[PDB]
Design a protein around this ligand. Structure first.
Ligand SMILES: [Zn+2]
Length: 46
């Protein structure tokens, strides 16, 4: 039944917001921004 899909995270740096991984820390610290500040798909604006 429930199998433990392997190959999920090969680095100590992982975003605790969405669930992503990075090879470095700077990439993780900067990535976080995508959350606090970001405009994903949505309605039409100007
Ligand atoms: Zn994230």
């Amino acid at each position: 039944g429930s199998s433990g899909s392997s190959g999920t995270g090969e680095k100590p740096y992982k975003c605790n917001e969405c669930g992503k991984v990075f090879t470095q820390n700077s990439h993780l610290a900067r990535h976080r921004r995508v959350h606090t500040g970001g405009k994903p798909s949505g309605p039409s604006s100007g």
